[PDB]
Design a protein around this ligand. Structure first.
Ligand SMILES: [Mg+2]
Ligand SMILES: [Mg+2]
Ligand SMILES: [Mg+2]
Ligand SMILES: [Mg+2]
Lengths: 384, 384, 384, 384
C-alpha cells in the first residue's frame, strides 16, 4: 500500500502545518516552513500540495517578501517534483472577515475580499493550479436578524460572477470549486451542503466555470451520506475537487485522517470514486491531532494515503468478485440502471402490466437480498 | 389570534387523521372519516385540506367505491367552503414500495409508481389542486451496495420528466413540489435537503414545472437552518409549497404542532414568509401526539394556526419598530442589500480603496451590533 | 468465523420476528412462530433466545392459551438445546401505556404495569432466565408540562424497589438490567443514557440487584461513544447485559445488524468486552431491514455473529502483536494504569517534581504517538 | 426586568473577557483587565464573578505578580460589592494538558494537574468561594487505543479523592461540582453527560463533597433535554452549580447568551429552577460572539440576565394561572406525584383492580390532554 505519483495524493500546507490551536488550547507544535512540508510530503509519496494565500505568504508581506516566499516554495517544488493543483484564499482568519468576505454586511469588506481573492488567483495560475477552491467559512450568522439570506445570496452570486469575468478576461484555464460546510465557525454557514452549493452554481452567469469541493467531514456534520452527495455531484458533472478526512458524527469538525471516522463510508466513497473514474487529485484536508509531535504528523499523513489504498484494493476486490456480481443481479442493481419507460409516456399509459394487471402482492413478496450483498461488502472490506 | 380564510391555513387529512401508530406502538385513536375532518377543520378556521390518494380512497377500491368516496368528500368541501390546494401520492406505505417508487431497483415497480401517480394527478386536477407534492420517502438505502445513486437519479429524473410531459400533454395548470427529507424511513433518503432538491430540479427537461416543498422538521433532522433554506428556495423562485410543524433537533421526525420545537426558528420563518410576501398556503404536516384523544387532536390543530398568528404579529412588530429599524442600519443590513461592485470589474480592480488603501484594522474594529439587534428580536418575540 | 455454544450469541424473538412495520409502512413479512425462530436460530449457531411477554404469549391470552404457547416454546428449546437467558416486559405497544408504564401519570396504569411485569418475572424464572431487562420506552414526554421528572423518578424508583422486594421475597436468582435510550418513541425518554441509568440505580433500596443493559445504537443516538459507556458500566460492576446492533449516527434508531453502522466502534467494543472477560450473552437486538424476505432475515442474523467473530479475531491480533504492545508503551498506556499518588496526599504536596521543578515545556514537547497506534489498530482491523 | 442582588447572577471572567479566537480566526477584541470586567458587570446588576486560576493570574507568574493581581481584583470586588462564589482550574489550555490533567497518560502530568488545582483551591477559599468546579475538557480521546477508560476512571477517582482529602484536611467549607461535556476539544470527553457524572460521584470516597455543574449547551450537544437532566440532578440532591447559555442543537459548543438557542428549553429550565427553589447562583458561561465590539459584549451579558427574568415572570404566571392549574389536573400531574403502591407489595399483588379487573381499553381511551396544557404554556411564554 505504498503511494505512487499516479495516485495523485495531495495535501494542504495547513494540514500537516496545523500547530494545534483549538477553541480551548494553545499550539502544541512549532510552525512548519512550507519548504519542509513539501520535502516531507514528497518523501511519503504525495504528488502535490495546496495552499491558502496566507499559508504561503504571511499576511501583510511586502512585494519583496512575497517574491522571496514564492521563490523558496518553487525551489522545493522543483527539488521534489511536487505539483500545486489547487489554491484558495483565506477569507476567514483575519478579524476583518468576522462577518464574511463575499457576504459581509460591510460593502468595503466585500470589495476587499474580492481583491484579495483575485490577487491569489493570479498566483495560483503562476504555480500551475487548475482548480481554485472557495470555502466561505465566515458567510452566515449566529442570529436571525444579522443576515438577510436572499441579499447575501445576491452578494455571493455577484462575487462569483465577478471572479468568472476575471478569469475569462485573463484567458485563464482555472475553474472554481465551492466547498460547502454546514456550520463552524458561524452558527450556520451559507451553502451548507453539496446540494445547496450545486443549486447555487446553476444561478451563476457562467455555471460551467464552477463545481463543488465536497469534504467528507462537512457533509457528515449534517448527518448526511457523503458517498450519496458525491454521487449527486458526479451525476451533475460538478465534482471539480474533493477533500478527504474523517469525522465521527455530528459534532465539531474533527478533521481526522482519512479512513478514521466512518470507515464504511470511506469504503463506499473510494468504491464510488474509483468506479466512476474520478480523475482529480485525492486531496487530504485533515489535521494531525494536537497530541502528536512531528513524527506523529508524518505518520498521520502517511495513514491518509495508506487507508485510501487499502480501501481501493478492497473495493476493487468486491466489484471483481463473481459472487458479488451475482448478488448485485440478485438485488436488481442491473435493473436500476435500465430506463423505466424508454417506450415512452403513451406506451406506459397503455401498458396494463403497469397497472390493471400488475400483481402488487407478488412484487411485494420479492426480497431485495440487500443483507447478503452488504455482508459480502463487509467480508471484502475486512479481508474475511 | 383567530384564523381567517385569507390566512390560507391548510392541513393534510393524514395529520389530524393520524391514528397514533409508531415504531413501538399500536393505534390510540380510531380512524377519522375525511368528511369529519373537513368539517372539524373548517370549524377551527382552516381554509383547506390536502390528501394522498390512499387517504381519500382506500387502496384497491373499485371504481364505484372510488366515486362514492370522492362524492362524499366533495359534499363536505361544498358544505364548508374548504379548498383542496394540493394533493400527493402514497408511494411509501404499501410493501410493494419497500425499495422505492420512482427509484425502486425493480423496473416493474417504477412503472407502477408512475401510473399510480398519474391517476391521482387527474383527481387532484378535478378537485382544483394547483400543486402536486412528491415525497420520495422510500427512495434511498440502508446499505451502500443496494442503491447506485447516479442510476437512481437517472430514474428519478426520468420519472419527473414523464410526469411533466403528462401534465403538459393534458394542458393542466398544476405544478410539482418535491419534498426533501434526509432519512426516515430509509437509512438515507435521496434528495435529502432543500439544496439537493433545488439542484436536481435544474436538471429536469421542464424545470419551470417543479419547485420544492420544504418541511420544517425535515431540514432540522439534518441540523440545518430552516429559515436559511427557505430563503434560498425563495431566491431561486422555487418555493412552491411549504410544510409547517415542529421538531426538537436531530432525531426521528416528530411532527410536532407548529410553534413547538424550535420556537425562535419558527419566529424567523414567519418573519421571512411574511416579509417576502409568500402567497401559498400555510400547510401543516404534523401529528397530534398519540397521548391525545380527539379533543386534543383539535386542540393541537388549532395551536398550529394560533402560533403562526402570534408569531406573525410579533415579527410584524419587530420590523415596524423604529428602534429595530435603527438597529438594522447599525448592523449594516442596508449595506448587505447594496451591490458590491455595480461599478464593474475593472473599476474594482482599479480602486485603491478596495486594496492598497483599505484600512483592515479600522474595518475590523467596527462592531456588528448583532447582539443588541437579536435582543430586540427576543424582546419582540416574548412581548417584553 | 462459525459460531459455537461458548460464544453465547443470543437473539430476541422480536428481532428476526420483526414483520417490517415502520412509521410509514405496513408489514413486509408474515409473523413467525417462535418455534420456527428457535429452530432457525439454532441452525445458525445461536445459543439462546429472549422474549417480551407479548412476543411469546399473545396479549390477552387465556390461561390455557398461555400454557399451550409456553409448552410449544419449551419443546423447541428442548429440541435444539437453546437457552433463555433473559426476558423482559412489553410496557410500550398497547395504547394503555401511551404515557408510560411505571411512570404513567395515571396511577392505575402504573399499578397494572407492575402486575404485568411481575407475572412475566415468574415465567422468566420458570424458563431459566437469570436477567430481566426493563426498557422504559414510553417513560418521558413530548412537552415540558406533561411530566414532572422528579415525581417520575420517584415513581420509577418505587416501581423498581417493589420489583426488588418481589424477587427477594420469592428467593429468585434473577437480576434486573435497565436499558437506556435517549428518545424514540417519546420525544425524550427518562434515563436517556448509560450514565443516567447507573446514577439512578445507586438510589434504589437494593442497588446490587440492578445493572444496565446498554444498546449500541441507543448511546449512538445521542452521539456518545458506546465503548466508553461500556467501560464506565464495567468500572462500576454494572454491566449485567448488552444489546448489540448497528446505527449510523444521530437519527431514528435503525437497529442494523451488528458490525453495520459504526464499524470502528464495533471493533473497539469487541476489544473491550473480550479484554475485560465479559461473561454475559452477546445478545443481538436488531431488525432485518424490511426490504428482506426470510432468506435475508436469516442472512442478517448470521451476519451479526459473523461480524462479532471477525472483530474478535482482529482485536485479539491487535493486542497480541508485539509492535502494538510496543506502541502502547510508547503512548504511555502502561502509565495510565499506575496510580497517580500511591505515596499519598502529603507526599504529593511535598514533591517539588510535581510543581516547582516540573518542567512543563519538556513534558508538553513529548508526543503521544496516538496516530501510529491507531494506524496499527486500523491495519489490524482491515487485515492489512 | 432589571437585575437585583438577590437574583444572584454571576459571570465567568472568561465569558465577557473572551477575545474572540476560534478554530478558524484570530482575536477580534483586546484582552480585558479583570478589574474592568468586575466594574462593568456590577454596573449591569450582576452579583458576582468566577475565575479559572489562569484568568486571574497569568500562567507562570511570580509570587509578587500573583499577589498584585489578586490585590487589584480584591479592590474591584470591594469597590463594587461583587462576590466570588465559585472558582475553577484551567487544566486545558497549556500544551502540557493536551492528553488530560487528572487522566493524562503521563503520571507526571497527573501529579502536576493536582498540584495546580490545590494551589487554586486555597485561593478560592481566600476569596470566599463555596463551590469549586472541575471541567475535564482534555480528559478523553480521539482514537480508541489511546485511552483505556477503566484505567482513566480509576485515575479520575484517585484525583477527586485526593482533592476531597485535601479540603477535609484543611477544614474548608468548599464543595466540588463536576461539569460534564460530551465532546470538544477531545473527540469524546470522559463523563460526557450529567448522568455519567452523577454515577461517577457515587463511587468517590466522600460523595457528599461532590455534585454536578451541568451546562445548558453541553447536554444539548448530545441532543439531551437539559431540564430533564437538571431534574435528575435535583432529585439526587447533587445540583451544586449550574452554567447557563444557549446552543442551537448538535454542533460545536456555541456558548450563546442565555435565552438564545432553544428558547422553550430555557423556559422549562427557569420554571424548574424557580419551582424547586434552587438557591445557587445563576451563572452564565457564554461568549459574546466575535462579531461584537465591547458595547456588544455588555449588551450580550445584559441579555443573559434579562432573558432569565422574562422567563421567570412567564413561568410564574403559568404556574399561578388557575386555567393551567386545572389543565395540570386534567393531565393527571397530581396523580404522578402520588405513590404507586403505598399499600405495599402484597396489597398490590392481591388487588384485582390492578390486574384481572383492570379495564385496559377504558384506561387507554383516556386522553392525556397534553396539547392543551402545552399551548397554555406557549401562550404564557409569548405573553399571548
Ligand atoms: Mg476543506
Ligand atoms: Mg411533509
Ligand atoms: Mg434493546
Ligand atoms: Mg461551563
Amino acid at each position: 500500500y505504498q503511494p505512487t505519483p499516479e495516485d495523485r495524493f495531495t495535501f494542504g500546507l495547513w494540514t500537516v502545518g496545523w500547530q494545534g490551536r483549538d477553541p480551548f488550547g494553545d499550539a502544541t507544535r512549532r510552525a512548519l516552513d512550507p519548504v519542509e512540508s513539501v520535502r516531507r510530503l514528497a518523501e511519503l509519496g504525495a504528488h502535490g500540495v495546496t495552499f491558502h494565500d496566507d499559508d504561503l505568504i504571511p499576511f501583510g508581506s511586502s512585494d519583496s517578501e512575497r517574491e522571496e516566499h514564492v521563490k523558496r516554495f518553487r525551489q522545493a517544488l522543483d527539488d521534489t517534483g511536487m505539483k500545486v493543483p489547487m489554491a484558495t484564499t483565506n477569507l476567514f482568519t483575519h478579524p476583518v472577515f468576522k462577518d464574511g468576505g463575499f457576504t459581509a454586511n460591510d460593502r468595503d469588506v466585500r470589495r476587499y475580499a474580492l481583491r484579495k481573492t483575485i490577487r491569489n488567483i493570479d498566483l495560483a495560475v503562476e504555480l500551475g493550479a487548475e482548480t481554485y477552491v472557495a470555502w466561505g467559512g465566515r458567510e452566515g450568522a449566529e442570529s436571525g436578524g444579522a443576515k438577510d439570506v436572499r441579499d447575501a445570496l445576491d452578494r455571493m452570486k455577484e462575487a462569483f460572477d465577478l471572479l468568472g469575468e476575471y478569469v475569462t478576461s485573463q484567458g485563464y484555464d482555472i475553474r472554481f470549486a465551492i466547498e460547502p460546510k454546514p456550520n463552524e465557525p458561524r452558527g450556520d454557514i451559507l451553502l451548507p451542503t453539496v446540494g445547496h452549493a450545486l443549486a447555487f452554481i446553476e444561478r451563476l452567469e457562467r455555471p460551467e466555470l464552477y463545481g463543488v469541493n465536497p469534504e467528507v467531514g462537512h457533509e457528515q456534520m449534517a448527518g448526511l451520506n457523503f458517498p450519496h452527495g458525491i454521487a449527486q455531484a458526479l451525476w451533475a458533472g460538478k465534482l471539480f475537487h474533493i477533500d478527504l478526512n474523517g469525522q465521527n458524527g455530528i459534532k465539531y469538525d474533527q478533521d481526522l485522517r482519512f479512513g478514521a471516522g466512518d470507515l464504511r463510508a470511506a469504503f463506499w466513497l473510494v468504491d464510488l470514486l474509483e468506479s466512476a473514474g474520478y480523475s482529480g487529485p485525492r486531496h487530504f484536508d485533515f489535521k494531525p491531532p494536537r497530541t502528536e509531535d512531528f513524527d506523529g504528523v508524518w505518520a498521520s499523513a502517511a495513514g491518509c494515503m495508506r487507508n485510501y489504498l487499502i480501501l481501493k484494493e478492497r473495493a476493487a476486490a468486491f466489484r471483481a468478485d463473481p459472487e458479488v456480481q451475482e448478488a448485485l443481479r440478485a438485488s436488481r442493481l442491473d435493473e436500476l440502471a435500465r430506463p423505466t419507460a424508454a417506450d415512452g409516456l403513451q406506451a406506459l399509459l397503455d401498458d396494463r402490466s403497469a397497472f390493471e394487471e400488475f400483481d402488487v402482492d407478488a412484487a411485494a413478496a420479492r426480497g431485495m437480498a440487500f443483507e447478503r450483498l452488504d455482508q459480502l461488502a463487509m467480508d471484502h472490506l475486512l479481508g474475511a
